[PDB]
Amino acid sequence: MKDFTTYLSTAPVLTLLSVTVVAGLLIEINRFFPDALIAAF
Amino acid sequence: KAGNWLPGSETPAYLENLPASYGFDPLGLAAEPASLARFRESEVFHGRWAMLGAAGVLGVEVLGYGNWYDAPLPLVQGGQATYFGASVPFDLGTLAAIEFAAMAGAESFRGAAEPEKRVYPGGAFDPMGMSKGNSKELKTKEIKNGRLAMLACLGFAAQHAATGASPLEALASHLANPMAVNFATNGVSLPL
Amino acid sequence: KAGNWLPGSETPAYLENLPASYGFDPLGLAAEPASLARFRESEVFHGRWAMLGAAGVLGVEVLGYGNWYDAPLPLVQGGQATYFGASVPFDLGTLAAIEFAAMAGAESFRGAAEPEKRVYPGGAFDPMGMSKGNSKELKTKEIKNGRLAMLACLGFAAQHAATGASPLEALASHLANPMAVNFATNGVSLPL
Amino acid sequence: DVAGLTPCSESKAFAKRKKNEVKALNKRLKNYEADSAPALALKATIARTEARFDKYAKQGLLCGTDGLPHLIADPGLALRYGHAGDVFIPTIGFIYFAGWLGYAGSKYLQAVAATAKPIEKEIIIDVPLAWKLLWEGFGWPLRAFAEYKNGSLMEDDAKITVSPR
Amino acid sequence: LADVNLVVGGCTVGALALGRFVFLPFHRASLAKAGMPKQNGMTHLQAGDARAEEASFILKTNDPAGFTVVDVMAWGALGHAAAFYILATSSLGLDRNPF
Amino acid sequence: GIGHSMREILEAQTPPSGSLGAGHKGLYDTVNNSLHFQLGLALASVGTISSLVAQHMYSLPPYAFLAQDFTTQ
Amino acid sequence: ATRPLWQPGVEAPKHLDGTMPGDFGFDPLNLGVNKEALNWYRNAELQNGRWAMLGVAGIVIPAELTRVGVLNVPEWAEAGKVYAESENAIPFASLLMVQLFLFNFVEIKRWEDIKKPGSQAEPGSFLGFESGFKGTGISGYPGGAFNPFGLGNSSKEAMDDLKWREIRNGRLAMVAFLGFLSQHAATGKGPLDNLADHLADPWGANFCSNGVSIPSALG
Ligand code: CLA
Ligand code: CLA
Ligand SMILES: CC1=C[C@H](O)CC(C)(C)[C@H]1/C=C/C(C)=C/C=C/C(C)=C/C=C/C=C(C)/C=C/C=C(C)/C=C/C1=C(C)C[C@H](O)CC1(C)C
Ligand SMILES: CC1=C[C@H](O)CC(C)(C)[C@H]1/C=C/C(C)=C/C=C/C(C)=C/C=C/C=C(C)/C=C/C=C(C)/C=C/C1=C(C)C[C@H](O)CC1(C)C
Ligand SMILES: CC1=C[C@H](O)CC(C)(C)[C@H]1/C=C/C(C)=C/C=C/C(C)=C/C=C/C=C(C)/C=C/C=C(C)/C=C/C1=C(C)C[C@H](O)CC1(C)C
Ligand SMILES: NCC(=O)NCC(=O)O
């Protein structure tokens, strides 16, 4: 699975998974914390 | 030298043999010899003018003739200025003309001389000759008193720009309650 | 030497031939010879002024003229100071100016002499000439009386910061009721 | 009132905008039965809109001529009037997070530059090394300031290519 | 507004006097250091501009200090500008003060 | 016999400590010999002045019954 | 190198040898890879730990004394406002400026000691007091006028033991002050009040019931 994990470590797979997890994290942030116009603490 | 301003630091090498040298040039403004020279005459001249100015500011308050701020006010919107409460017959334009002529003459004769004589000219400027007997320490006194007087004049200007009182009345107000009248209490210095 | 501060201790080497030396320097402030040389004169000077201050406060309280704290209180409130019932028409500004001039002259003409001469002089300061003929034990007496006087003066300051009464009045109140009139009883010294 | 602006808690046009949005959503409501899935979706949308408007009125935003929140992008003008969360606090937040990402990428570049084949390591990313450097990049400001004071953050101009003028 | 004759004459005489006795050495030093305007090395005249030749009515003067007619006219012009400035600013009777 | 040699003014505008290198050493000949340098300076200044003219005549209308003719402005 | 570590199984980083007090090999972010930066961070750790120890003492001892009816000291979070309402209270800005001026004078000297460890000890600096700033060769451990009782200056390893005790106490008090800040930010009660509430019902009274730690939006 060394070659398979090397394929998973290739630049397109890693950038698509990274933008996927970042977009999903931001989406769930807006799902639980919607309409956050300002950083009101 | 006698001094270090930052005791735990190394001072610039070009500030060692000069009088009143504490090695204070953290910005490196006088790394060149000509600039260091020009700064030296500028420092001594500013110190002398500031000593005269601070002496005048203190003396007009202690003799009771207003502060340093309302002194030119009688000459404006009317005329008839006062010195020691007396009378002078000169208005603003001719006073500026006479002062410009006198200062032009004095500073054109001073600035056309030797560089050492542009800051330390003996003879008629030392009538009793007390510069003899090692003038290094007395020069250190002169530049230090000048530095204190420049600080004092800047303080007069800034305090009047912030609080609007006279320097001696500001001093008395500070002595009234140093807890709650200092520079942190007005709305100007600290933006709170 | 006479004494060792603690009964059993290691003694600093630089505190043996000094008068009234007990080896009391646990901080090691006088490890350098110059530090000890300056601090010796500082201690002598502090002891002398503390003796003068203790004599002043005791003589102003037992002679029935007023309290030492209330001495500069009538200096404002209009004016007119008190000294043996004298009117003395000197205001606050001129008094401070004269005192500053006198102290500046005396201290400038004082501390420009030799290190031994700055602290231990002769001439008109010992007119009866009894510094000669064993001066070490007399110096020891001077230092010990000075230390006692500094303790007395700081005690007067702390006592007036605490209870706020006179020195001799507090002494009389302590002698009258030694139970509830101590340093411990007021709510400023012992919080537990 | 920092620049002729009124708070949205008391500005009338903010309440008018909220009322108009809720009324439009109610007009959308008045077509389905009470317990249908579109009815629940519209009720959730209404609740979100009212919560958003009440939160904007609560947080102390400034409204202009009409009821739209305005942000202040001046330190001091926003600090002493309590609107540092408009621009200043998100400025600090972005600076921190962008510095984290950029420092992680930089350290990955300098880590794989001194390997056998730096060419291969940039298309074939060493995932454990990237994860470690992404974790280490959370202390990016202190590391960057330390490397700047050390002089190892910048490169000397004599070792950098330029054109022949 | 205090007599144009006295103000203009006094200011012109003063400008001439401080130009002849006070400001003459520094002006001479500046004129010596700056000197001719030079182009590509040589001056304008040496490059062929015959109109740029130093006029001969200023080169030699019987003044002991070499105060030429052009210096006289420049200093008189400066004095006239100062005199008319003070006359005009004393003619107006309005509150220009920031008080 | 009076006035300025602009070459010497450019020569004297050299700050110490090498802040600007040689300062303005020989910029007089650089501008004077090059017609393209002069044309670039002239076009830059004239374009900035044209922008100033645009920004000023709308906000400070100079001509009588301007800023009522909306098409003209 | 065989000293106990922050993870029995994870070897220490090569920039943490064991010489520094409290070196348990804990640096997962590798912030102290630069030696000079490591020295600066060691001094910062000492200063933060000492100030946190002083602050946590001044929080938990007066609060405990108030709990047992001694002195009656208000809450540490509102103690600034309690004094600020006094009839002879120094204004906040003036008091802050006085404190900052004194601390400027002191800690610029401390800073210059951080650079060169024998900085302030040169003759002619003060008025005879410069002899007390010799230092012990390690910045952050001045000695001289400081440490009057001379604790640890006897066997060298005695001072290293005290150094480790100091650094562990400082880290504990720093964590404690972070806890005080976070506990008062969530629950409007004192640290001892939070402790007493936790002992009443640990499964009910904690950080999962304040409503501020875990956001209500998620649950
Ligand atoms: C027409 C009369 C006259 C003449 C011919 C001169 C001539 C001269 N003065 Mg002088 N001066 C005059 C009037 C005159 N002064 C008056 C009325 C005053 C007030 C009492 C001064 C106060 C004064 C001081 C304090 C100094 C001189 C100096 C000099 C010499 C240096 C050349 C120079 O000024 O640099 C070039 C000329 C200029 C740059 C013109 C600008 C003038 C402005 C006001 C100076 C800018 C500084 C500004 C106030 C502060 C900087 C910003 C700061 C807030 C950060 C020169 C020979 C300096 C010296 O001794 O040699 C170094 C010196 O330090 N003068
Ligand atoms: C992490 C890598 C990295 C870093 C540290 C930088 C840093 C910098 N870039 Mg650059 N850049 C990058 C990647 C990077 N860039 C990539 C991939 C591209 C191609 C799209 C560019 C294209 C680019 C241009 C055209 C310019 C810069 C400029 C700059 C400088 C201005 C600041 C800035 O953020 O500009 C903006 C940076 C971007 C718009 C690109 C950001 C793209 C992503 C977010 C970075 C890559 C993330 C990386 C994969 C993370 C790896 C994690 C690791 C653990 C594996 C700055 C020093 C400007 C400059 O020269 O300033 C003087 C400039 O003109 N960059
Ligand atoms: C050294 C250095 C170096 C490094 O590296 C950097 C840094 C830091 C930057 C530095 C520092 C600097 C500084 C501090 C400066 C300042 C100065 C001054 C203040 C001056 C004044 C100066 C000042 C001055 C002269 C003044 C003078 C005055 C006068 C005359 C007055 C007069 C008067 C009088 C009598 C009164 C009346 O009624 C009015 C009048 C008429 C008004
Ligand atoms: C040695 C050492 C070393 C080691 O190592 C460490 C340690 C421990 C730190 C040390 C110790 C120290 C100490 C103890 C110190 C102290 C001091 C003092 C007490 C001073 C005082 C001091 C004090 C003093 C001078 C005082 C003085 C006083 C006076 C003048 C008074 C005056 C007066 C009088 C007459 C009366 C009136 O009515 C008022 C008046 C006018 C006010
Ligand atoms: C090691 C490491 C390395 C790796 O690599 C990475 C990582 C992970 C990042 C790391 C970790 C870190 C950490 C943990 C940190 C923390 C810190 C702190 C907490 C500090 C504090 C610190 C703290 C502090 C100073 C504090 C202090 C305090 C005070 C003074 C207080 C005061 C007070 C009092 C008395 C009371 C009153 O009524 C009020 C007040 C006024 C308020
Ligand atoms: N050269 C005089 C001196 O050293 N004075 C020190 C002191 O004030 O005791």
Tab-separated table of N, CA and C in Angstrom, chain G residues 133-191:
chain	number	residue	atom	x	y	z
G	133	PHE	N	25.213	43.947	40.906
G	133	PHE	CA	24.668	43.445	39.650
G	133	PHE	C	25.680	42.595	38.888
G	134	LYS	N	26.561	41.900	39.612
G	134	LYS	CA	27.546	41.039	38.962
G	134	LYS	C	26.873	39.908	38.198
G	135	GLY	N	25.840	39.311	38.782
G	135	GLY	CA	25.194	38.158	38.197
G	135	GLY	C	25.949	36.878	38.497
G	136	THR	N	25.282	35.757	38.230
G	136	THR	CA	25.857	34.437	38.442
G	136	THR	C	26.255	33.759	37.137
G	137	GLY	N	26.347	34.521	36.047
G	137	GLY	CA	26.693	33.985	34.752
G	137	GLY	C	25.516	33.518	33.925
G	138	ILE	N	24.357	33.319	34.545
G	138	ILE	CA	23.136	32.930	33.851
G	138	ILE	C	22.124	34.048	34.047
G	139	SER	N	21.600	34.571	32.942
G	139	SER	CA	20.597	35.621	33.022
G	139	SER	C	19.301	35.078	33.613
G	140	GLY	N	18.597	35.941	34.344
G	140	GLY	CA	17.415	35.544	35.074
G	140	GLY	C	17.679	35.062	36.481
G	141	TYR	N	18.945	34.884	36.855
G	141	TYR	CA	19.342	34.487	38.205
G	141	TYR	C	20.372	35.499	38.686
G	142	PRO	N	19.927	36.688	39.108
G	142	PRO	CA	20.875	37.774	39.397
G	142	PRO	C	21.706	37.556	40.651
G	143	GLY	N	21.054	37.278	41.777
G	143	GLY	CA	21.787	37.218	43.024
G	143	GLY	C	22.180	38.613	43.493
G	144	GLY	N	23.213	38.654	44.332
G	144	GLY	CA	23.706	39.916	44.857
G	144	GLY	C	22.752	40.575	45.831
G	145	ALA	N	22.181	41.718	45.439
G	145	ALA	CA	21.140	42.342	46.250
G	145	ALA	C	19.920	41.437	46.351
G	146	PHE	N	19.552	40.797	45.248
G	146	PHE	CA	18.576	39.724	45.289
G	146	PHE	C	19.193	38.502	45.960
G	147	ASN	N	18.322	37.614	46.443
G	147	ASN	CA	18.683	36.483	47.293
G	147	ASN	C	19.475	36.939	48.517
G	148	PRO	N	18.854	37.662	49.461
G	148	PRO	CA	19.601	38.060	50.667
G	148	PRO	C	20.024	36.893	51.538
G	149	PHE	N	19.172	35.877	51.682
G	149	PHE	CA	19.470	34.770	52.582
G	149	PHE	C	20.530	33.825	52.035
G	150	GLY	N	20.891	33.945	50.758
G	150	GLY	CA	21.903	33.088	50.175
G	150	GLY	C	21.510	31.626	50.155
G	151	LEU	N	20.301	31.335	49.689
G	151	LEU	CA	19.829	29.960	49.623
G	151	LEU	C	20.338	29.308	48.344
G	152	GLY	N	21.050	28.192	48.489
G	152	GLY	CA	21.529	27.433	47.357
G	152	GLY	C	22.931	27.762	46.890
G	153	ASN	N	23.535	28.846	47.377
G	153	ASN	CA	24.888	29.213	46.954
G	153	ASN	C	25.974	28.483	47.738
G	154	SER	N	25.752	27.211	48.061
G	154	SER	CA	26.659	26.447	48.908
G	154	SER	C	27.280	25.261	48.190
G	155	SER	N	26.495	24.493	47.431
G	155	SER	CA	26.977	23.254	46.834
G	155	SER	C	26.726	23.141	45.336
G	156	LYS	N	26.250	24.202	44.680
G	156	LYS	CA	25.904	24.236	43.256
G	156	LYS	C	24.734	23.311	42.914
G	157	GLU	N	24.792	22.019	43.264
G	157	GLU	CA	23.611	21.189	43.031
G	157	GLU	C	22.453	21.562	43.949
G	158	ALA	N	22.728	22.222	45.077
G	158	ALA	CA	21.646	22.748	45.902
G	158	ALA	C	20.888	23.849	45.172
G	159	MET	N	21.602	24.692	44.423
G	159	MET	CA	20.948	25.743	43.653
G	159	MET	C	20.182	25.175	42.465
G	160	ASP	N	20.698	24.106	41.852
G	160	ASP	CA	19.995	23.469	40.744
G	160	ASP	C	18.689	22.835	41.208
G	161	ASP	N	18.686	22.246	42.406
G	161	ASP	CA	17.450	21.722	42.982
G	161	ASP	C	16.430	22.835	43.191
G	162	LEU	N	16.871	23.957	43.765
G	162	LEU	CA	15.985	25.098	43.958
G	162	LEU	C	15.526	25.681	42.628
G	163	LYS	N	16.380	25.635	41.603
G	163	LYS	CA	15.982	26.108	40.279
G	163	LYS	C	14.856	25.258	39.702
G	164	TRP	N	14.954	23.935	39.850
G	164	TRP	CA	13.898	23.053	39.364
G	164	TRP	C	12.609	23.248	40.153
G	165	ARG	N	12.720	23.436	41.473
G	165	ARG	CA	11.535	23.735	42.275
G	165	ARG	C	10.883	25.037	41.826
G	166	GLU	N	11.700	26.057	41.553
G	166	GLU	CA	11.185	27.340	41.090
G	166	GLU	C	10.474	27.207	39.755
G	167	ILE	N	11.064	26.468	38.814
G	167	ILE	CA	10.465	26.392	37.487
G	167	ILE	C	9.185	25.556	37.514
G	168	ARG	N	9.142	24.496	38.333
G	168	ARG	CA	7.910	23.718	38.431
G	168	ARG	C	6.805	24.513	39.114
G	169	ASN	N	7.144	25.257	40.172
G	169	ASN	CA	6.150	26.098	40.828
G	169	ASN	C	5.661	27.203	39.901
G	170	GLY	N	6.566	27.783	39.108
G	170	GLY	CA	6.165	28.813	38.164
G	170	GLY	C	5.250	28.289	37.076
G	171	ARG	N	5.549	27.101	36.542
G	171	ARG	CA	4.670	26.503	35.541
G	171	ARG	C	3.306	26.164	36.133
G	172	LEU	N	3.291	25.621	37.356
G	172	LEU	CA	2.027	25.307	38.012
G	172	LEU	C	1.198	26.562	38.248
G	173	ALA	N	1.841	27.654	38.668
G	173	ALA	CA	1.101	28.885	38.912
G	173	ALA	C	0.665	29.559	37.616
G	174	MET	N	1.433	29.407	36.535
G	174	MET	CA	0.987	29.923	35.244
G	174	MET	C	-0.262	29.194	34.766
G	175	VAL	N	-0.262	27.862	34.879
G	175	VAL	CA	-1.454	27.084	34.551
G	175	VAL	C	-2.607	27.471	35.470
G	176	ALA	N	-2.304	27.733	36.744
G	176	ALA	CA	-3.330	28.136	37.699
G	176	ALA	C	-3.937	29.488	37.349
G	177	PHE	N	-3.120	30.441	36.899
G	177	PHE	CA	-3.661	31.753	36.559
G	177	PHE	C	-4.467	31.699	35.269
G	178	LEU	N	-4.028	30.885	34.304
G	178	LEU	CA	-4.860	30.637	33.131
G	178	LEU	C	-6.193	30.021	33.538
G	179	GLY	N	-6.160	29.105	34.509
G	179	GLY	CA	-7.390	28.543	35.035
G	179	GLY	C	-8.270	29.571	35.716
G	180	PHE	N	-7.665	30.488	36.475
G	180	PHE	CA	-8.433	31.543	37.135
G	180	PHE	C	-9.126	32.429	36.109
G	181	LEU	N	-8.386	32.830	35.071
G	181	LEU	CA	-8.947	33.689	34.032
G	181	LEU	C	-10.085	32.992	33.296
G	182	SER	N	-9.873	31.734	32.902
G	182	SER	CA	-10.912	31.014	32.175
G	182	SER	C	-12.106	30.681	33.062
G	183	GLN	N	-11.875	30.424	34.351
G	183	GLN	CA	-12.969	30.102	35.257
G	183	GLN	C	-13.827	31.324	35.541
G	184	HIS	N	-13.204	32.491	35.728
G	184	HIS	CA	-14.008	33.685	35.951
G	184	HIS	C	-14.661	34.184	34.670
G	185	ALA	N	-14.040	33.938	33.513
G	185	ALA	CA	-14.669	34.319	32.253
G	185	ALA	C	-15.947	33.527	32.010
G	186	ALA	N	-15.947	32.241	32.361
G	186	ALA	CA	-17.134	31.414	32.177
G	186	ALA	C	-18.110	31.582	33.338
G	187	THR	N	-17.642	31.355	34.560
G	187	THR	CA	-18.475	31.406	35.752
G	187	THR	C	-18.111	32.630	36.578
G	188	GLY	N	-19.106	33.453	36.895
G	188	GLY	CA	-18.860	34.653	37.671
G	188	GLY	C	-18.636	34.404	39.150
G	189	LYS	N	-17.729	33.484	39.472
G	189	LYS	CA	-17.400	33.149	40.849
G	189	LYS	C	-15.894	32.966	40.971
G	190	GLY	N	-15.415	33.002	42.211
G	190	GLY	CA	-14.001	32.911	42.488
G	190	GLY	C	-13.443	31.522	42.269
G	191	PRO	N	-12.112	31.400	42.299
G	191	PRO	CA	-11.503	30.064	42.166
G	191	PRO	C	-11.882	29.120	43.292
